Amino acid sequence: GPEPDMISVFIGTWNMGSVPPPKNVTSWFTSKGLGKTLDVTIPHDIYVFGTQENSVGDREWLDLLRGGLKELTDLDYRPIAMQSLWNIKVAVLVKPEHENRISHVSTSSVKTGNKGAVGVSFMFNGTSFGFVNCHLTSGNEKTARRNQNYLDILRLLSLGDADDISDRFTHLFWFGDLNYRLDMDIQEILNYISRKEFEPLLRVDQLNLEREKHKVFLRFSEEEISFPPTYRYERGSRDTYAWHTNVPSWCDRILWKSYPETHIICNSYGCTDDIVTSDHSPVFGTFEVGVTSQFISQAYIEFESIEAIVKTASRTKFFIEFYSTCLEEYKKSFENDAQSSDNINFLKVQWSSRQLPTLKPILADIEYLQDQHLLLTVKSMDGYESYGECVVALKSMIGSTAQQFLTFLSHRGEETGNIRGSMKVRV
């Protein structure tokens, strides 16, 4: 009980339109405006600010953010880190008291016009966080290029540390001017916007469509959108869309991907309507997020069997590597001892208990172990390349009797099958 079990995280994304911001951006910080909004006078534990087309210097911009929070909260928020890629910038600020809870800070950037992404990662006690702020390709017809920018960022971002960042963090937030547009005629768009009927517009949102096709943001969630398209506004008010062609669109988005059986709840998601220097409106999202401090405040993990369904026609043997922060070093299986055809595109590979390792956690405490996760990777014996990664929560696995886990494999932005197994955690 002495340490935090839960924190409140603010994420903001704002394309500043290459002009100075207004002195007062308080509405952004406080989730005031349109959509799912707040009233709450209680400052967040962490503020993450992502910006695009930001012409304010790195230091000056950080000073504006600290000064604004100081004015709002009377606390001096501490920069954990900041990363810029020319006019694409991200800053993470934290309440003074959490300074000593932060460790393993990392930053990275990927350039894909200035387009690309900047990232920050760290641990908060035993829980890891990643934040990716991006500006993807512009224009209604450039969906394929946006998708490719996403894949390049995913592949090249060197945050944390696996093959890519998608499974590296307990909670991964990806936000920015993703630049996906509405696939609809201007007249219909404007009619739905005036009547405040966003559901028919969301049906033709290109990001939603590409996510459903499994091209981008595998495993990510986004909160329901109840606020109007944030692009493209005439400057100086929010009365008019400048569409002369740039149809109104939800360019500016916040998404997340979390490890299984963790606590995360979106408390707000919306845009401001009183910040008018840019052709985009700022977007805010706030989250209540579980944090594990059990390590701060003999055990064995055993496997009776594992069965993977893997996208491949290879006749090579396979093994599994097991990684976790609760282990001194990773472990690996022997080769699979049975194999068969699942489908025309998939093989079934099976490891009996004989082929599988016994993992030995760093601490034997039951509450500690309940908050841990294992990263499993299926690799070929010929060349050692990965065919799929997944994450398994220990939460429901504590006992003398083996229980089943079931989850899904991915690799390099593709779904590559599934994995089912029988395990137990003994203390």
Residue numbers in the entry: 418 to 456, 460 to 532, 539 to 587, 592 to 674, 683 to 735, 745 to 874
List sentences quoted exactly from the publication behind this structure.
The two main enzymes responsible for PI(3,4,5)P3 degradation are the tumor suppressor phosphatase and tensin homolog (PTEN), which removes the 3-phosphate (3 P) and the SH2-containing inositol 5-phosphatase (SHIP), which dephosphorylates the 5 P to generate PI(3,4)P2. Importantly, even in the absence of a localization effect, the C2 domain provides activating signals to the Ptase active site, resulting in a significant increase in catalytic turnover.
Crystal structures of Ptase-C2 FLDD confirm that few hydrophobic interactions remain intact between the Ptase and C2 domains. The FLDD mutations also disrupt interdomain hydrogen bonds between R649 and E862.
